[PDB]
Amino acid sequence: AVKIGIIGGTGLDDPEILEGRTEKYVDTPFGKPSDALILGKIKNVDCVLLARHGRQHTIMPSKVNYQANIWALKEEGCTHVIVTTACGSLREEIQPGDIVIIDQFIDRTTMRPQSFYDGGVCHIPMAEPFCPKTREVLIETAKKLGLRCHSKGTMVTIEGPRFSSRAESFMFRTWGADVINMTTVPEVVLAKEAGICYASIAMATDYDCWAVSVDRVLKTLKENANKAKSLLLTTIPQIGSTEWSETLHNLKNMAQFSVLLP
Amino acid sequence: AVKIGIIGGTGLDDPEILEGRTEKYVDTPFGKPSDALILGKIKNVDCVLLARHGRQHTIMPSKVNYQANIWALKEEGCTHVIVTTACGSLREEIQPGDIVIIDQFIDRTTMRPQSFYDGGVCHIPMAEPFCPKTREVLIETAKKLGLRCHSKGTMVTIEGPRFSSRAESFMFRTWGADVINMTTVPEVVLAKEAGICYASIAMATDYDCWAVSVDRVLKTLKENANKAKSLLLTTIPQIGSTEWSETLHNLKNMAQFSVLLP
Amino acid sequence: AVKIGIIGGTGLDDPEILEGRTEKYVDTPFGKPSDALILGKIKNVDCVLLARHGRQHTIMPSKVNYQANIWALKEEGCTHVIVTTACGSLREEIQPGDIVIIDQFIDRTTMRPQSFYDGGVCHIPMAEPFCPKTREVLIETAKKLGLRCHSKGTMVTIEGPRFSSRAESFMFRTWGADVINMTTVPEVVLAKEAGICYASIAMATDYDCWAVSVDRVLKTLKENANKAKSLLLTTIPQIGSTEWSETLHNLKNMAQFSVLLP
Numbered sequence: 001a002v003k004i005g006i007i008g009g010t011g012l013d014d015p016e017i018l019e020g021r022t023e024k025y026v027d028t029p030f031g032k033p034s035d036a037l038i039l040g041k042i043k044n045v046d047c048v049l050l051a052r053h054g055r056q057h058t059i060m061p062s063k064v065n066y067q068a069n070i071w072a073l074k075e076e077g078c079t080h081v082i083v084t085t086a087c088g089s090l091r092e093e094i095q096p097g098d099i100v101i102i103d104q105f106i107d108r109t110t111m112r113p114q115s116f117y118d119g120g121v122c123h124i125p126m127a128e129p130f131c132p133k134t135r136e137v138l139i140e141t142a143k144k145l146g147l148r149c150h151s152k153g154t155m156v157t158i159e160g161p162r163f164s165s166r167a168e169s170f171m172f173r174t175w176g177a178d179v180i181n182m183t184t185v186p187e188v189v190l191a192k193e194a195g196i197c198y199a200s201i202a203m204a205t206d207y208d209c210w211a212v213s214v215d216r217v218l219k220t221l222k223e224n225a226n227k228a229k230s231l232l233l234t235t236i237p238q239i240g241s242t243e244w245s246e247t248l249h250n251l252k253n254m255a256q257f258s259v260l261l262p
Numbered sequence: 263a264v265k266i267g268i269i270g271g272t273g274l275d276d277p278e279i280l281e282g283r284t285e286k287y288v289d290t291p292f293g294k295p296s297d298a299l300i301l302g303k304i305k306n307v308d309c310v311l312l313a314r315h316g317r318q319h320t321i322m323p324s325k326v327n328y329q330a331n332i333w334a335l336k337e338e339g340c341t342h343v344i345v346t347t348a349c350g351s352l353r354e355e356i357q358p359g360d361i362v363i364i365d366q367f368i369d370r371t372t373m374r375p376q377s378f379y380d381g382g383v384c385h386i387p388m389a390e391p392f393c394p395k396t397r398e399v400l401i402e403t404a405k406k407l408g409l410r411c412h413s414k415g416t417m418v419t420i421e422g423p424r425f426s427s428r429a430e431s432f433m434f435r436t437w438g439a440d441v442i443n444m445t446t447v448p449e450v451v452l453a454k455e456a457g458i459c460y461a462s463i464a465m466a467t468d469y470d471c472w473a474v475s476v477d478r479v480l481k482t483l484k485e486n487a488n489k490a491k492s493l494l495l496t497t498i499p500q501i502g503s504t505e506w507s508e509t510l511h512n513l514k515n516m517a518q519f520s521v522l523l524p
Numbered sequence: 525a526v527k528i529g530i531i532g533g534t535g536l537d538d539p540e541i542l543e544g545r546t547e548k549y550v551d552t553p554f555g556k557p558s559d560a561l562i563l564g565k566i567k568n569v570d571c572v573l574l575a576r577h578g579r580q581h582t583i584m585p586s587k588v589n590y591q592a593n594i595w596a597l598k599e600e601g602c603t604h605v606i607v608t609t610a611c612g613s614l615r616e617e618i619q620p621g622d623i624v625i626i627d628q629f630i631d632r633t634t635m636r637p638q639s640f641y642d643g644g645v646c647h648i649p650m651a652e653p654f655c656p657k658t659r660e661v662l663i664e665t666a667k668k669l670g671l672r673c674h675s676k677g678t679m680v681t682i683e684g685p686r687f688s689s690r691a692e693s694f695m696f697r698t699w700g701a702d703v704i705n706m707t708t709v710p711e712v713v714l715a716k717e718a719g720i721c722y723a724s725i726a727m728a729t730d731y732d733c734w735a736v737s738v739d740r741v742l743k744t745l746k747e748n749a750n751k752a753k754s755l756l757l758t759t760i761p762q763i764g765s766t767e768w769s770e771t772l773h774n775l776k777n778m779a780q781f782s783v784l785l786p
């Protein structure tokens with residue numbers, strides 16, 4: 001059986017997406033998650049919703065307890081984790097409102113714990129950071145819904161809370177980055193360490209500055225949130241009808257063998 | 263009315279620049295500024311001088327309390343902030359002794375608080391980090407003084423205290439950086455958050471290593487400090503004769519709307 | 525006279541390399557070193573061995589006390605420091621098992637103290653981070669041993685503990701990096717500040733991901749550790765037969781004049 005964890009990003013964390021919801025505040029060895037876990041279902045698939053910045057959206061990217069969030073979802077029994085995230089576009093073809101099913105990341109964060117093994121020692125591989133099988137279903141589903149969707153993309157995650165300078169924005173383009181946010185790393189890294197199939201639904205809200213402002217971002221998100229909701233509602237039932245016995249087995253093995261015992 | 267805050271950099275923090283000076287030690291919600299504020303005037307313009315590294319120059323780049331410094335200047339009523347900074351040149355055309363009126367930056371710092379909102383949440387735009395109107399006057403004034411001056415430039419700020427390796431120096435050139443220091447970020451970022459018109463007078467002291475040493479840097483600064491002093495003395499009266507009612511209004515608005523309320 | 529400090533890296537820290545060994549636990553102003561110092565000799569040359577991750581290899585890259593390690597070696601009287609380090613290859617010509625006598629580095633670490641002067645202020649030059657005379661002997665010796673050895677290379681040091689993403693791996697190649705590890709910085713930086721001749725024997729264990737895993741790395745290291753051991757055993761006697769009176773004098777001077785007194 002599968003259980004989908006869902007981490008709602010800025011303006012993309014509507015709990016109405018789940019039926020038969022039940023709130024559940026939890027705790028973890030790394031502190032409390034951003035907010036209470038929302039247990040519920042999409043069709044016959046068990047899901048767990050968690051607002052990344054809190055239902056009040058008061059926690060800044062740098063202060064989000066990524067460790068607690070991923071740990072909590074794992075503890076609740078989540079096999080997969082699909083998240084949503086607002087980001088800026090670094091490519092002309094990626095227009096505001098467009099969905100990007102990212103497949104790579106470039107870390108630009110500086111003050112963020114990125115491992116559960118803060119002391120054995122865990123050196124987890126990051127070649128393919130996002131669950132390919134889940135990304136495949138998201139892409140096919142976006143297509144069935146007729147949505148503008150990019151099948152891949154490299155997300156550069158900055159520390160924030162400030163936005164990038166134009167020089168940084170142009171620089172990131174030369175490094176091969178396609179979109180930019182403040183939350184993909186270390187969320188994706190910790191999910192890998194937990195042996196969880198992780199995928200991200202990035203929602204381009206602007207062209208960064210290669211013009212970007214809070215109001216601009218919140219505005220585009222409001223106008224496009226429905227897309228991410230529809231994609232999740234349609235995608236998830238499809239995951240609950242596929243076999244992941246082997247896929248999850250490989251993630252479990254990679255995570256375990258990446259730990260150096262004393 | 264306007265009040266110019268002046269942050270003196272290494273070997274470019276001579277308080278003799280101001281007339282009718284009065285020392286004033288202050289405190290802020292983020293601790294004490296690098297040193298006492300020096301209230302005074304340049305012609306009929308009120309100014310506030312603050313030595314970035316302390317009149318004894320004992321505070322290292324990484325330990326400077328940028329938050330307190332900017333907060334203190336803002337509290338004292340500063341509308342503008344013009345600073346001086348020693349830097350290394352990453353371009354052949356930028357010769358030691360040359361002044362560079364920087365217009366962009368690339369962050370390479372890692373352990374520095376960059377916001378006043380360390381917890382609402384402030385996501386301040388950084389497209390145009392330096393006050394264009396002030397930069398314009400600095401450039402025209404350098405021209406009137408017959409000084410070698412570059413009208414723009416991208417400053418990469420490293421964490422320090424160590425200088426860059428040759429591989430990093432060459433790498434920064436490929437990212438589009440023109441000069442390099444250890445203090446522009448987050449000073450410029452926090453000034454933007456405070457709604458202050460910020461501009462920087464960068465003084466190239468060497469060609470970094472693409473050879474750079476403390477003695478080399480201090481030597482070139484000693485020989486060229488007079489330029490920055492003359493530029494400030496001549497520029498400031500010009501700012502006190504221009505209208506900024508609208509310019510300051512836009513900075514105030516951008517700062518305010520960049521705060522996410524709980 | 526000379527005394528060679530040896531910092532053993534992952535799977536390259538065998539104490540059997542020294543004769544007439546004597547364990548010696550020490551303390552420093554920055555805490556205790558990774559493990560006890562192992563005093564001994566290679567022929568008639570006094571050496572001091574120190575396992576970077578501890579004889580139990582339980583300390584992760586980010587948590588290694590580089591300050592204490594370098595301080596301890598300096599206090600014991602070490603004039604030179606030759607280390608070994610497992611790394612990933614970012615160049616086709618650098619094959620797993622190959623030795624790389626690195627000559628440059630690119631810092632990608634974020635949470636690491638990099639100076640002994642955490643408060644005067646020390647701004648130490650990093651143009652030529654590795655001792656050229658020692659690198660020369662290592663290269664000639666590898667040649668005499670008939671080993672595959674690269675005479676130079678740029679090491680990019682990531683924070684870890686996670687490995688790089690493919691996007692980061694490709695990005696590092698464009699920045700000019702040749703190999704990648706998690707320990708060169710700040711070990712090399714602090715050694716320079718201490719006025720110590722520092723050189724590194726990098727052992728390529730894989731092609732990173734431009735596939736890399738703990739087991740892959742440990743496997744290649746086990747199969748190739750003998751090379752680093754032979755190189756050290758053969759190189760060190762050669763250093764004890766050369767003159768360094770002037771070489772060490774210049775390092776001492778550069779370190780001293782890089783300190784800003786209050």
Ligand SMILES: CSC[C@H]1O[C@@H](n2ccc3c(N)ncnc32)[C@H](O)[C@@H]1O
Binds near residue numbers: 061086088207209
């Ligand atoms: C409330 S706007 C800031 C938030 O939106 C995301 N965002 C949107 C556009 C954008 C950009 N151009 N650069 C960085 N983060 C961005 C970030 O992950 C952060 O949590």
Ligand SMILES: CSC[C@H]1O[C@@H](n2ccc3c(N)ncnc32)[C@H](O)[C@@H]1O
Binds near residue numbers: 426647
């Ligand atoms: C006392 S020399 C170090 C100081 O001078 C500035 N500086 C000068 C040259 C230079 C360089 N090549 N790289 C980095 N900082 C530099 C830095 O901002 C630091 O506060």
Ligand SMILES: CSC[C@H]1O[C@@H](n2ccc3c(N)ncnc32)[C@H](O)[C@@H]1O
Binds near residue numbers: 609687706729731737
């Ligand atoms: C036990 S594997 C991790 C350790 O081996 C080194 N290593 C080996 C290959 C490699 C890579 N591709 N990227 C980063 N570090 C690496 C690092 O310095 C770390 O201490």
